[PDB]
Amino acid sequence: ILEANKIRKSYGNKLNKQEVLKGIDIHIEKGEFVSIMGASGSGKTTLLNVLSSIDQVSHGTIHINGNDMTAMKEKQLAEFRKQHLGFIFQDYNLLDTLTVKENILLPLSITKLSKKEANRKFEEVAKELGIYELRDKYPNEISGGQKQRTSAGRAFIHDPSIIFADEPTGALDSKSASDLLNKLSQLNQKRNATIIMVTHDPVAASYCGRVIFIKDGQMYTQLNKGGQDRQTFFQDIMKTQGVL
Amino acid sequence: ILEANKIRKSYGNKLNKQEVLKGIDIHIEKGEFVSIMGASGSGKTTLLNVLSSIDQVSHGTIHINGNDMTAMKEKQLAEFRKQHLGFIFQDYNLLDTLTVKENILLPLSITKLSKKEANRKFEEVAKELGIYELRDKYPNEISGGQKQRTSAGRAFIHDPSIIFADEPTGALDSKSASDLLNKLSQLNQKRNATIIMVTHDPVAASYCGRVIFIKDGQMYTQLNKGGQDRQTFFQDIMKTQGVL
Amino acid sequence: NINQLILRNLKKNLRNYYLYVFALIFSVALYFAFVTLQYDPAINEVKASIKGAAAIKTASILLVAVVAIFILYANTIFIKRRSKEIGLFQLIGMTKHKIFRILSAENVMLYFGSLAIGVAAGFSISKLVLMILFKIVDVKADAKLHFSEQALVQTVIVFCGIYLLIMIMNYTFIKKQSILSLFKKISFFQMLIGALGIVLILTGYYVSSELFGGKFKTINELFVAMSFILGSVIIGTFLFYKGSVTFISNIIRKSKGGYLNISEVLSLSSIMFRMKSNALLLTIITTVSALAIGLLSLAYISYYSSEKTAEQNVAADFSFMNEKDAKLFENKLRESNISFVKKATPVLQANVDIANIMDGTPKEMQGDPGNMQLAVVSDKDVKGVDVAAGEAVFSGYTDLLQKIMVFKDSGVIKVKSKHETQPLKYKGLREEFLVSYTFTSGGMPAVIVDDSLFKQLDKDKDPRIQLAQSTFIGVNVKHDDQMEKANELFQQVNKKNEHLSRLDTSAAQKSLFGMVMFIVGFLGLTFLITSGCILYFKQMGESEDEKPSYTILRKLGFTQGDLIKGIRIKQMYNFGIPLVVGLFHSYFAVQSGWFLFGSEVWAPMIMVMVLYTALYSIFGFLSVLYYKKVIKSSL
Ligand SMILES: CC(C)=CCC/C(C)=C/CC/C(C)=C/CC/C(C)=C/CC/C(C)=C\CC/C(C)=C\CC/C(C)=C\CC/C(C)=C/CC/C(C)=C/COP(=O)(O)O[C@@H]1OC[C@H](N)[C@H](O)[C@H]1O
């Protein structure tokens, strides 16, 4: 699906230019769990922002499902961003005056599916994550990880093509983060939906199939895992990070 | 620097009297980052009012830089607070109709000071905080993070020693809060200044080293970090807060 | 450095609050115009029943009582919005006197720079107000006027006296300020509150429906019923906002379950928690708006039906009481080349029994049913009907009478003669009028009997209830001509003005009700502007108090063009609920008061509500225009 070809961005404030993206080649097929990580002042965040439609492009070509995006219109870009490309944010971004059901079912109002198909799909989506008990509780009495799980459920409603995750496990303990990662892996294995995550935690990258070690806008190859044990892959990633 | 001994606040509107504070023993040295946690209903605002000398104390002794607060009158108290205290608030309360440079320099122009040293101080502060680029802009075209950094810079124009700060990360997202906390962190390693912080979210307190808990006054223990990697410390704070 | 700050604050405040300046200018101009109108010696040509020079004196007091309240209330939100601006100055270090001086140095300019334009605009409107008044009433021409310095003195004194109250209120607020001040599920009591809020209004409407022509009829008893209705309709309106819109909104919300849309999220999140907080200002707005609309419509009904009431009061174009004046009038008209069709008809006053024809109660009497005074005429005089023996036919319509004096079908009617009683039966009711109101008592129609029966009725002539003149000498007129000179001749005929003319009776009522028209219309326009400005000012807080919801909605995929529609349909309800309640109050108030101010309705009521809505929609549009700005800057 995703096809990045030498996408490059230059940071300019009309007086100084400091390019951060110099040479990108990403090959992503339908149905994998990849991760982007490396350093702390690199262009990985900018890479994720330019891969999606949240930020513009400077020099490069990106194709998602065959569609052209680099020279695509603004209104059509917004329509595409609303129709596909579900997002999971670092923070909760949950409305306080509504409930869980309204919060995770509102983005389905634009495409009218009546009061039958939406209500049938909400149960299916929310029972996989095990939040069906939380159908009328306002998002101020529930725990921490349940809000993130509701956000993921909202991102998983309309069956999008590509899901971009920007540091999901950032403000959670070990148990909640592990449970959320396991649920995301189960959802990936159930329905074919590509998931891309940017994280700083080796445990988060352990659940992934591929990882890219960005280095100030370079490649430094990548891992493949495949027929490899979870723990052994964890030590391999730890060694690779220790090399850096 | 400050010493808190039997810090108590009085009440008694009509019949009912509220004893929110029942004596505290807080020992804070010079030049370290201290955070005070707690929970809703702990009267942290009353504690801030008592320690900031805004609200007149009722019982106990408070010493600011070796000087008892009660030893001076109201006008002398105001003069001492102006000479040795700053403030950082949850909101972005600023003069909308004043430029960033003038808004920062406003507290300094009162005490009959020449323009040359004021400009030098503004240059130093802006270069340290990295907001010099917004030297002649307006607060109506500036994001929340830069507004909060401008307020913090205003709080350092006349060097405090026991500067207080309420929750800065109340109306900030993850990135802006992280940037502001980082900047305040390198500002501590400079000229010594107590940066007492009264936030309740563990993410903000993960950058501290003197986390203190309040249940009645000090029922829970305290953490010191020292050799941790900012992640095990945060996990420990999360666990010990979940114990409650 | 202080001067630059003051100038910048003045420039900023001249842009956020401009409707305030517009309202000040409008109020000052209207007050100056009214005072100049009252003190000028030119309104002496407009007089029907009241002097006029004293009505303006009363109308110039309520306007001040409204404007002063508006100013003293709307200059409190302005000082409350500066709450997080005095604490910063106190932290920097300033005496309260400096803060007071800084705050007042801007208000002085912003007030006097508008007061000096309001007075200068009184000249352009002084003559136009006279033109409008002279067009509503009938008068010939001409209006010159002069400076009338008394008006300037009075206006300056009043609008300088108000500023001292403003200043003392601001000083009290500044001193009262704290040292720094810088740091749900449904209940069951609200069930009862929401039930009562609708029950009281509905029962008030139902009781007000049967006020006139009902089971109770007594001058000392209708006062209590009126007070009860006017208390119920107010208590219900007050309870309708503080715990009755929440019920309806909760019922609506618990009807869709899950799936929703952004068109309803904003409304269902804001209306319930915002309309409850302000549930004393909206009550006042609705009640005063209903009171103004009802009074204007009730005056315009009478102004519309005066031309028919005058024609109904007198059967012909001229009426006379004595033969001498009638023959003098016709002698004068003889050489005036204005031929007249003069017909005379004697009237024999008599009383009968109409107890059996009552469809209601003896309380609806207006006279003894068995001994009610009526008028009897023969049949040869009438050129439209030819009655027979034992038949009595009524005449006239009297739309008021049909609502009170309801008549049954045929029956038996007893003639209360001196020593005899000949019974007849009721044939039917005509529509035209035959006898002026002088000889028919209040409004009782005259009866028509057979010529043969009248041949003995006039012979009897019971001399107990006979009037001074048992004749109806009346001089009609030919086809359309110069009736003005005929009216002048009639006026010069009666030096004691002891006769009746159609034109005079129409003009008197027209002028008397046109004066009230003018006064109430202007005093209602002022309140409309005031209420619109107050509501627009109150709507400014929601923009700044909802930004950390637009900044989140725009990060989910939505665009400004999709939020603006929801904003529009939220503002629609927010600005429309009080208007709808006021319209319902006015409609159910007018419907219990017609058939008493004259003839036709549904002509003025819509013609007033349409204008009111058209003049009320402007602030609703401006509120959306303001929301667009904060929406654009949400990101
Ligand atoms: C503003 C103010 C001053 C006071 C406030 C109260 C008030 C009265 C308001 C006006 C009303 C409004 C608009 C209120 C807004 C507010 C609300 C809440 C509305 C909804 C309330 C609600 C749901 C119901 C309440 C309705 C009521 C209380 C009245 C309506 C009936 C009404 C208009 C009048 C009846 C009361 C009288 C005294 C009549 C007499 C009028 C009159 C010329 C008498 C003279 O005799 P009449 O016979 O008529 O005339 C000649 O008489 C000699 C000849 N010979 C002939 O007989 C004949 O030609």
UniProtKB/Swiss-Prot annotation, chains A, B:
Highest taxon above the source species: Bacteria
GO molecular function: ATP binding; ATP hydrolysis activity; transmembrane transporter activity
Residue numbers binding ATP: 38-45
GO biological process: response to antibiotic; transmembrane transport
Up-regulation conditions: Expression is induced by bacitracin, via the two-component regulatory system BceS/BceR.
Statement: the UniProt record of this protein carries the keyword Amino-acid biosynthesis: no
Domain (ABC transporter): residue spans on this chain: 2-241
A single cellular component GO annotation: plasma membrane
Keywords: Antibiotic resistance, ATP-binding, Nucleotide-binding, Transport
Keyword Repressor: no
SMART domains: AAA (SM00382)
InterPro entries given in the database record: AAA+_ATPase, ABC_transporter-like_ATP-bd, MacB-like_ATP-bd, P-loop_NTPase
Chain's role: Part of the ABC transporter complex BceAB (TC 3.A.1.123.5) involved in bacitracin export. Responsible for energy coupling to the transport system.
Subunit structure: The complex is composed of two ATP-binding proteins (BceA) and two transmembrane proteins (BceB).
Annotated PANTHER family: ALPHA-D-RIBOSE 1-METHYLPHOSPHONATE 5-TRIPHOSPHATE SYNTHASE SUBUNIT PHNL (PTHR42798:SF7), LIPOPROTEIN-RELEASING SYSTEM ATP-BINDING PROTEIN LOLD (PTHR42798)
Family statement: Belongs to the ABC transporter superfamily.
Record protein name field: Bacitracin export ATP-binding protein BceA
Originating species: Bacillus subtilis (strain 168)
Swiss-Prot record, chain C:
An example Gene Ontology biological process: response to antibiotic
Location in or out of the cell: Cell membrane
GO cellular component: plasma membrane
Keyword annotations: Antibiotic resistance, Cell membrane, Membrane, Transmembrane, Transmembrane helix, Transport
Transmembrane segment boundaries: 17-37, 59-79, 114-134, 151-171, 186-206, 221-241, 279-299, 515-535, 577-597, 605-625
Up-regulation conditions: Expression is induced by bacitracin, via the two-component regulatory system BceS/BceR.
Membrane association type: Multi-pass membrane protein
Top-level taxon: Bacteria
Pfam families: FtsX (PF02687)
Major site of localization recorded for this protein: membrane
Role according to the record: Part of the ABC transporter complex BceAB (TC 3.A.1.123.5) involved in bacitracin export.
The protein's assembly and partners: The complex is composed of two ATP-binding proteins (BceA) and two transmembrane proteins (BceB).
Family to which the UniProt record says this protein belongs: Belongs to the ABC-4 integral membrane protein family.
Protein known as: Bacitracin export permease protein BceB
Organism expressing this protein natively: Bacillus subtilis (strain 168)
